[PDB]
Structures are given as C-alpha cells and as structure tokens.
Write a protein that binds this ligand. Structure first.
Ligand code: SF4
Length: 59
C-alpha cells in the first residue's frame, strides 16, 4: 500500500502514531510523518480510517 499524508489537513493529533507507530510518527513540527511510504501493515488502513481530518490516504 502507498501511504501519503496531506500536511494541510493534518492537525497533529497523533492518533495515527498511537495506532500504527511503525508507519506514522508525530514530528516535532506538530505534523505526521510517514515512516513507511510503502507498507503492508494492516494498521496503515486503520490509522487512515481513524484520522479526524482524512489527511492520510492509503492506496
Ligand atoms: S491522525 Fe491525521 S490529523 Fe492526527 S496526526 Fe495523524 S495524519 Fe495528522
């Protein structure tokens, strides 16, 4: 799966990191960072579905 994040939609809540720490990390600038742009981890989808602003897209 291709994982991307739209910085403009990201509010820096950190829910994606809570759910899938190996794929997402809340950076110091208060924005999510995608550690695994291409991943097979099922949690990437879960984090996307839980993002409050839909900033994460998993294809
Ligand atoms: S869950 Fe969404 S809004 Fe919250 S830090 Fe992750 S990408 Fe940003």
């Amino acid at each position: 799966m291709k994982v991307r994040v739209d910085a403009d939609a990201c509010i820096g809540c950190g829910v994606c990191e809570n759910l899938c720490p190996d794929v997402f990390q809340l950076g110091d600038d208060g924005k999510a960072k995608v550690l695994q742009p291409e991943t097979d981890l099922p949690c990437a989808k879960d984090a996307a579905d839980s993002c409050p602003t839909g900033a994460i897209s998993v294809e």
